[PDB]
Design a protein around this ligand. Structure first.
Ligand code: AA5
Ligand code: AA5
Lengths: 303, 303
């Protein structure tokens, strides 16, 4: 394949039939989003948000994009903005992966650091605050903007179907902003009412009423129920334990050469769990958002 | 694309015509080998090496593979040996990228650390010594084994020609083992004598008689002149400065969303340099062996 710009490599990621032991002898399919130029499923979102921002006449040549992110979206966004020569300011909460930040910076963005404890909420508050002091500015707001799920709706979703060798029994996915799950579940359920949708979250997330605290799994986890969920018939909301997610990261890497992040491990943990209360010979599809190489600074592969 | 195992992702890497300013208004094409499952062009060698090892009846189910690597070859070899249930011991000099080491152990290899000052030469001596204490063992020996250049000869080389939109004026490549350069130059020069072959080494490397010292650029650099060089007519040997390599690593990421390792920077450095003693409108092809995300622990993006 011959490419001119890096943006061409966004999407069209492989779908792998994990050569692993699945209960009731069913099959789990994962989309290796880490093969995106920026190394995360977020690359898609980023390009799309900026596109939407342009088409809606809310962004121009000298506009200053400001957005709260945990890092991966910041990367996907910085890549897009970089392509359009758009000044970028990313607001990210203090304790997230060093590499994401270095990468964000490396791609040309300017990071604003909010207190670890304030989480995404503080980052969002801070982004909007700054947006109000910068006249020519646009805040994509990936946690509310509908363009978010719309993004995965026309790219990811169709791509999953195209590779699937059979009817998708269920679709498990991790949720950070929710965008990925929603936008894809939306498309899949609207092509087969049967496809059950399942959201996954780390212990310490609110999606299941649990108490709100900090988790070791990174990338997923919510601090308020995501607005993009009324477009999907949520068949079940699973809360995966930290050790469970990481244990999977370790295994997949040691037994099937799969370098996957925690969010990806949590997804696999969830998908394998759902496999038990599902008909035999079923067909589950899930998403691995990024590589474990992105969390090597956190000793991801340690116990 | 639907895949069964990760090994199916090795190779068929994109060829990018870098959207950058070039001397004499020529063009530089780079093969983004960081898109391999293991994140490096080494994935190729690792597979081929073990493959050759089997066909030559030098490897069996219970054999212990021992190889001196700087990390990448080790990762690719770990993948391949993991695929055949082969025990792996990788001898790597002390000061190479941490991530490479983590990945190597996470993939299942066992690392043996040689002194940083002894370099690859200390790594080789140690490999061979260990190899002689283990009866059923095979040392692929990427620095001497002809399977090395051969591996890229039938994969990488053809791949380049496949996408190249015009005759290749010259092919610039970094050298660590020599393999990649020799292998690809060999094929290319035998498909067009006009195609010039240029090797690239970091300051501190012996190719140009320089004094032998430690360099910041990682992945390339030789401590003896690689034997695979008699198969190619070396048209020029460029020794690239550390700052030069890294300055490119910085630029491509801040201007064209390209996350590249130092080895890929020295490469671009040398390629652009050559564009100045080459006809106008020329066509140069080079190779970016791995991502910058692999040297984040080393502050790759810092000045
Ligand atoms: C915690 S919050 C965060 C958000 C995003 N992410 C995100 C993510 C996910 C989810 O996805 P969504 O669309 O749902 O958000 C997964 N994984 C991973 C790794 C990631 O990073 C960013 O980055 O900004
Ligand atoms: C002494 S040097 C070392 C060798 C290998 N590498 C290698 C490499 C290169 C070169 O390639 P070659 O085939 O020539 O060796 C580049 N880059 C990168 C990143 C890398 O890692 C290993 O790893 O072991």
């Amino acid at each position: 394949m011959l490419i001119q710009h890096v943006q061409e490599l966004i999407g069209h990621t492989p779908l792998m039939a994990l050569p692993i032991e699945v209960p009731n002898h069913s099959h789990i399919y994962a989309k290796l989003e880490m093969f995106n130029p920026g190394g995360s499923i977020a690359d898609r979102l980023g390009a799309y948000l900026i596109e939407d921002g342009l088409q809606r006449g809310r962004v121009n040549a000298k506009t200053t994009i400001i957005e709260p992110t945990a890092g991966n979206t910041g990367i996907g966004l910085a890549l897009a903005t970089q392509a359009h020569h758009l000044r970028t300011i990313l607001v990210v909460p203090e304790k997230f992966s060093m590499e994401k930040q270095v990468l964000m910076q490396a791609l040309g963005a300017e990071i604003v650091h909010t207190p670890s404890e304030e989480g995404i909420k503080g980052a969002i508050r801070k982004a909007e605050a700054l947006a109000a002091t910068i006249s020519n500015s646009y805040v994509p707001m990936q946690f509310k903007n509908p363009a978010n799920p719309a993004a995965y709706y026309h790219t990811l979703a169709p791509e999953i179907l195209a590779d699937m060798p059979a009817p998708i029994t269920a679709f498990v996915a991790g949720a950070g902003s929710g965008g990925t799950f929603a936008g894809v579940a939306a498309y899949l359920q609207a092509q087969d009412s049967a496809t059950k949708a399942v959201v996954v979250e780390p212990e310490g997330s609110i999606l299941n009423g649990g108490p709100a605290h900090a988790h070791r799994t990174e990338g997923i986890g919510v601090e308020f129920i995501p607005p993009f969920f009324d477009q999907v018939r949520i068949d079940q909301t699973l809360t995966i334990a930290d050790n469970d997610a990481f244990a999977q990261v370790r295994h997949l890497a040691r037994d099937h050469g799969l370098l996957i992040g925690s969010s990806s491990g949590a997804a696999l943990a969830a998908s394998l769990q759902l496999a038990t209360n599902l008909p035999a010979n079923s067909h589950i599809v899930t998403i691995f958002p990024d590589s474990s190489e992105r969390y090597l600074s956190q000793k991801i592969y340690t116990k």
